[PDB]
Amino acid sequence: MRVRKRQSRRTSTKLKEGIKKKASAHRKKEKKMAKKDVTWRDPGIPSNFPYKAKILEEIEAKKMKDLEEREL
C-alpha cells in the first residue's frame, strides 16, 4: 500500500494559451488542406417504422401522378 503521485488537474495559464494557439494553427491548416486536396465528393425509410407500406404506396402514387401531371 504505497500510493503514488497523482497528476495535477490545476490549469496552467501558459499551457491553455499554447493550446489556443495550437488549435488556431490546426484549424487554419485543416482549412487550407481541405481547399487544396483532391477527393471525389438518402438513408430511406427505417425498417422499424410501422407504416412503411403506407409511405411507399404514397410515394409511388405521387410518382405515378406526377408522371402524367407534368406531361399533360
Binding site: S47, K52, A53, L56
Partner: peptide
C-alpha cells in the same frame, strides 16, 4: 394468436422488402 401475428408481420415485411 401471438405467433400468428408474428408470422403475419414477417410476411408483410418480406413483401415490403421485395417491393
Amino acid at each position: 394468436t401471438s405467433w400468428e401475428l408474428k408470422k403475419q408481420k414477417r410476411l408483410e415485411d418480406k413483401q415490403f422488402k421485395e417491393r
